[PDB]
Amino acid sequence: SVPSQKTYQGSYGFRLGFLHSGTAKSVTCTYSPALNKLFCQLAKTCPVQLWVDSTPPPGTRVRAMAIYKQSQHMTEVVRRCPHHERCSDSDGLAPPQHLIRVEGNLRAEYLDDRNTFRHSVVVPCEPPEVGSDCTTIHYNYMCYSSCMGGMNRRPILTIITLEDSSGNLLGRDSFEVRVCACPGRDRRTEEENLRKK
Ligand SMILES: O=C(O)c1cc(I)c(-n2ccc(F)c2)c(I)c1O
Ligand SMILES: [Zn+2]
């Protein structure tokens, strides 16, 4: 009833990577290594790199799922709030309840788990474009961390799993997410709080 968040590189040496976007007031997505935390604006592009040491088999897929970070909320399904699930901002593929979307990939599949009711979005693994050393997925987060009746100020983490064609685990990584109006300032604030602690 709670998905694992254990980092697991597995046989293929799977791990995530993030750009270095800085903390200017205008930034729309920025990752803090010190906090292992992505800060992003509502519905804006979040580039997440996938890195491996060796090529996984054809049919390998990459799944994203959100869970609440705090143990007393971990069993609650992370979903969009009562406002955003009704705002008809559909892309034709993502169910309106799903917090996490993949942008610009017609092969993205969205799962409502029949037993846990949790949401996830999964895409096929594709090799890097010629001249690149990693593959990038573009995610969108479709509610603010603060949305009442949804995340309601509770922190979440995104779990990224590398899976075989049956859905068996090959690799896992994760990061905390805050969806907020000013990710640059919030990253600076939280990094300073960490330093002061
Ligand atoms: O180099 C390759 O040949 C190569 C092949 C693949 I399929 C992938 N890959 C894509 C998504 C993922 F989770 C892993 C990657 I990243 C690669 O660097
Ligand atoms: Zn919302």
Residue numbers in the entry: 96 to 292
What does the report in the manuscript say about this coordinate set?
The tumor suppressor protein p53 is inactivated in the majority of human cancers and remains a prime target for developing new drugs to reactivate its tumor suppressing activity for anticancer therapies. The oncogenic p53 mutant Y220C accounts for approximately 125,000 new cancer cases per annum and is one of the most prevalent p53 mutants overall. It harbors a narrow, mutationally induced pocket at the surface of the DNA-binding domain that destabilizes p53, leading to its rapid denaturation and aggregation. In addition, this large-to-small residue mutation creates a well-defined, narrow surface pocket in the p53 DBD. This pocket is conveniently located distant from the interfaces involved in DNA-binding and protein–protein interactions, presenting an opportunity for intervention using small molecules stabilizing the DBD functional fold.
SAR development using a diiodinated salicylate model system identified several halogenated pyrrole motifs as promising substructures to target the buried subsite 3 in the Y220C pocket. Pleasingly, halogenated pyrroles 20–22 bound with affinities in the low micromolar range (15–38 μM) and displayed strong stabilization of the mutant. Notably, 3-fluoropyrrole derivative 21 reproducibly displayed the highest protein stabilization and affinity from our library (ΔTm = 1.9 °C, Kd = 15 μM) and represents a moderate improvement on the unsubstituted parent 4. Interestingly, a preferential orientation of the 1-aryl-3-fluoropyrrole in the pocket as the aR atropisomer was observed. In this preferred axially chiral conformation, the fluorine engages in hydrophobic contacts with F109, L145, V157, and L257. C220 adopts a “flipped” conformation with the sulfur atom 3.9 Å from the fluorine, probably precluding fluorine–sulfur contacts due to the positioning of the biaryl scaffold. The aR conformer was the only one observable in chain B of the asymmetric unit, with the aS conformer only detected as a minor conformation in the electron density in chain A at ca. 25% occupancy. Fluorination of the 3-position of the pyrrole provided a modest although reproducible enhancement of Y220C thermal stabilization.
